[PDB]
């Protein structure tokens, strides 16, 4: 309002406390932006890692798993996403960096590839990936032999459909 001039600054005192309210409001909305991120991404206790030898029954997760030779250890599809999108004014940095959030999503993704839904209810219990896929088929009302007799076709369809997200983005 004044820009470092004592004449304007003394007249401003006559307006009371409007400018302590404005700062209180902006601080209250800058704290909840970090609260917003904490409740979407910190949904794990452990940071789970995936095994070095990756045989998941024909399913291929290589375009969504972290890539060490990339910036911030992001996945291949997390990169396409980060490439597509003075006077009393300042911008505060977020509490979680982008590296930390990519770490959180890789822990969620290694928990689900490897334990199914067990890690969101307690300790993670490993199960082979095709048997997890058979449980999920049971959950929609198809029998398990329909997965086990069509494993290679279901895995090819999944791989070919993950390959199209990458093109469309």
């Amino acid at each position: 309002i004044c820009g470092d001039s004592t004449e304007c600054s003394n007249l401003l005192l006559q307006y009371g406390s409007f400018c302590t309210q404005l700062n209180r409001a902006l601080t209250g909305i800058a704290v909840e932006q970090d609260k917003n991120t904490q409740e979407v991404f910190a949904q794990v206790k452990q940071i789970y890692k995936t095994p070095p030898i990756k045989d998941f029954g024909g399913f291929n997760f290589s375009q969504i798993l972290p890539d060490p030779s990339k910036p911030s250890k992001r996945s291949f599809i997390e990169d396409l996403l980060f490439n597509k999108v003075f006077n009393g004014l300042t911008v505060l940095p977020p509490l979680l960096t982008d590296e930390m959030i990519a770490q959180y999503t890789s822990a969620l993704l290694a928990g689900t590839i490897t334990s199914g839904w067990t890690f969101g209810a307690g300790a993670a219990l490993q199960i082979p990936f095709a048997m997890q896929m058979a449980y999920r088929f049971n959950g929609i009302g198809v029998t398990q032999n329909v997965l086990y007799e069509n494993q290679k076709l279901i895995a090819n369809q999944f791989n070919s459909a993950i390959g199209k997200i990458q093109d469309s983005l």
Binding site: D4, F86, N87, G88, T90
Partner: protein
Amino acid sequence: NGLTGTGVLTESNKKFLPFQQFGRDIADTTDAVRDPQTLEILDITPCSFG
């Protein structure tokens, strides 16, 4: 010359046009100037605050 402000002046890598006397950016703040004796253009940076 009448351009009045406060800040820290450094030397720059801009190139005005011979008739142009000072520069300004988006939001229309002055961020460069030409001084009327050396004929050199200088960057203007606000003095640190926080």
